[PDB]
């Protein structure tokens, strides 16, 4: 009631299109109130795993800041969006810290990102020299020279473009369908309490 604005969570969960995981979007949520019961009473989520906070208790807590990261990954890759997990996505695309406090929310989006029309080109990073630090973003598209000959900016024998499309256009299994993911990070620091429940 001190901050008289509604947290704009709509443009995160409800956007027409999400970002590719390698270029994951982050929106900073600050000085606003939110009725989180609309979130934890929704049945539209196939994944709602929280760490350090109780989901049904979000309205009882206030936070200094809230971060909302969103992206699209394969179904079988959603389990990598969790503290302590490893894999192609956790190592090279999006990585949560070991002391993560927040919630990982995911839902099947075959109806949105695999429509008969197309044009949504979701991609991921196949390889990186070192693993991503927690909450690090890498949007480099530099062709990697893995052999002896210089690449001169073109793909080749050992000249690998670092990104690859998911191939969501055809019909594939549930584990191979696109899933939209939102990661809410709740930060309780020494600053005044801004993002509260109601």
């Amino acid at each position, epitope marked *: *009631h001190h901050h*008289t*604005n*509604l*947290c*704009p*969570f*709509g*443009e995160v*969960f*409800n*956007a*027409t*299109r999400f970002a590719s995981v390698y270029a994951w979007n982050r929106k900073r949520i600050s000085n606003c*109130v*939110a*009725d989180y*019961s*609309v*979130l934890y*009473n929704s049945a539209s989520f196939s994944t709602f795993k929280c760490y350090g906070v109780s989901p049904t208790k979000l309205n009882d807590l206030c936070f200094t800041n809230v971060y909302a990261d969103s992206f699209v990954i394969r179904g079988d890759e959603v389990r990598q969006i969790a503290p302590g997990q490893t894999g192609k996505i956790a190592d090279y695309n999006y990585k949560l810290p070991d002391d993560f406090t927040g919630c990982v929310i995911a839902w099947n989006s075959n109806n949105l990102d695999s*429509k*008969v*029309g197309g044009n949504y080109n979701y991609r991921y990073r196949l390889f990186r020299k070192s693993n991503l630090k927690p909450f690090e973003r890498d949007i480099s598209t530099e062709i990697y020279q893995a052999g002896s000959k210089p690449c001169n900016g073109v793909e080749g024998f050992n000249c690998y473009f670092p990104l690859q499309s998911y191939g969501f256009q055809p019909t594939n299994g549930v584990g191979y369908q696109p899933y939209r993911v939102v990661v809410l990070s709740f930060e309780l620091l020494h600053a005044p309490a801004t993002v509260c429940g*109601k």
Partner: antibody
Amino acid sequence: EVQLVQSGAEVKKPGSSVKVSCKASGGTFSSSVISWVRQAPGQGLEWMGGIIPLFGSANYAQKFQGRVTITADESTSTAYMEMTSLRSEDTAVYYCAKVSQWALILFWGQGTLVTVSS
Amino acid sequence: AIRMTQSPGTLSLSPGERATLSCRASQSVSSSYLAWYQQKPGQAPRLLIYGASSRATGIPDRFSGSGSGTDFTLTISRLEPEDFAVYYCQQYGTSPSWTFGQGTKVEIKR
């Protein structure tokens, strides 16, 4: 699950006032921007004003600042649009339209015909 | 105040043609909070597009929304007979402050 139900059509004589209601179901009421839209016969859509029930601070378009008051009742999830000093130019269909902070879609009522005639 | 002006006022096309409707904003408007409505005579407005480009339930894919900043566009790739109607755009947001365009009528050329 979310659904906006407005009260029935009304016939008001000039000079009187009318209070249209709009009952929301589904839990998104408090954390929503609930507006009132008006459409006079043969004309387009006109936004009159809105309110956030959590704050109770209504905002109004300039055209309606004088004679329109918008209230919200969280205990019953009902919004209201009261218009005083009705004139025949106020004969229109009145819609409540609502946006939840958790989505970008708009939720609409069915409309309320208000006829100003003696 | 923000003003949304639609162009053209009337659009006279034949079934099977492509309709391009414009919605101009007086300021920059967030593409997360721009909508399109279809209205047939005697009917309440039908939400077509929300969030600049998302199709509401049941809306066919021949309706597509786009644009950003101050120029938004509703494209009907192939006009069906049921598509001839009036289309409004709307600026909204998470504050009580919305505006509508004055509308565009898509009618049958003859």
